[PDB]
Structure formats: C-alpha cells, structure tokens
C-alpha cells in the first residue's frame, strides 16, 4: 500500500536523508514530507495466491446456476451450502472447492 499527499493528493515517493539517516515519504510536487512508519519500500511476489479467494460477493447465494451441497458449516452448522472452484483462471490453478453458507455467507474449505 502507498500513501497520498495530504495537501495536493499526489503520490508520496520515499526519500532518504543523508544527514539524518531516515526514510521519509515526500511529494515531488511540493515541500510536504511525512515520516515513514515501516522500511518495506517494495515487495514483489513471483508466485502469488491473491485473487484466489478474493473473488467473493455477498449475494452469491442468490445465483440459481450454482450447485448446492450439504456440507457442514464450521460456524453456524447449517445443512445447506453453495460451492464453486477457484476464481483465479491461470493454468497452474488448483481444483479445490470453496463453500459458502446460506446464513453466515463465509468462505471455507474442506481440508
């Protein structure tokens, strides 16, 4: 996550002080400068799993084309649920199922 300038809404690029030895987020369109909280400047994931379970909506139980199972809900122990596979559509994607209860509407696995 990256922060924005509080006065002109531009991006806050990180900057390093030679004399003070501190990491600071500074806007290049002004003189505003705010002290950085964490040193994690950049992170790149070669193999990522985000978007696998992130594709979830709160009204997925109203879809009539989705199959319905009788798996046990971990939270409220309901007897009706709706399952589907991974929303990510790469070639390496697993065939595991995500179950959605019809009362608490949370996503849970079978393992």
């Amino acid at each position: 996550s990256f922060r924005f300038c509080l006065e002109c809404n531009n991006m806050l690029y990180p900057k390093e002080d030679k004399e003070n030895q501190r990491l600071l987020y500074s806007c290049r369109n002004c003189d505003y400068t705010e002290l950085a909280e964490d040193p994690k400047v950049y992170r790149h994931e070669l193999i990522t799993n985000i978007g696998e379970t992130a594709g979830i909506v709160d009204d997925i139980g109203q879809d009539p084309t989705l199959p319905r199972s009788d798996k046990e809900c971990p939270e409220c122990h309901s007897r009706d649920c709706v399952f589907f596979q991974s929303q990510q559509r790469r070639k390496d994607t697993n065939m595991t199922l995500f179950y959605v209860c019809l009362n608490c509407k949370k996503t849970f696995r079978d393992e």
Partner: protein
C-alpha cells in the same frame, strides 16, 4: 548410467537449466541505515550470529 536410475537422475539434474527466478519466491527492499545491525527482528538473531 543407462541401467541405473540414481545416476540417470543425477545426469538429468546436471543437464536441466535452473535459474534464480525458479527457486525464488518473493523479493523485498528494506531500509536499514546500520551496516552492522538491522531493524528486522526475525532475521536479527541470524545476522548478529553471522557478524559475531
């Protein structure tokens, strides 16, 4: 090597191309102005063990 499976697997491993990107999983950039110490707590023990 043709009638032994282990030597064949050794040859196969020695022939196949393997880059850093294959074994790498994630790369990160951190700010740390102390050459002899570090800010990260998980790796602090290992790096101080190295320096000592």
């Amino acid at each position: 090597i043709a009638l032994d499976i282990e030597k064949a697997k050794v040859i196969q491993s020695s022939i196949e191309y393997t880059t850093l990107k294959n074994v790498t999983s994630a790369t990160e950039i951190y700010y740390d102005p102390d050459p002899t110490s570090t800010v990260i707590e998980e790796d602090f023990d290992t790096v101080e063990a190295y320096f000592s």
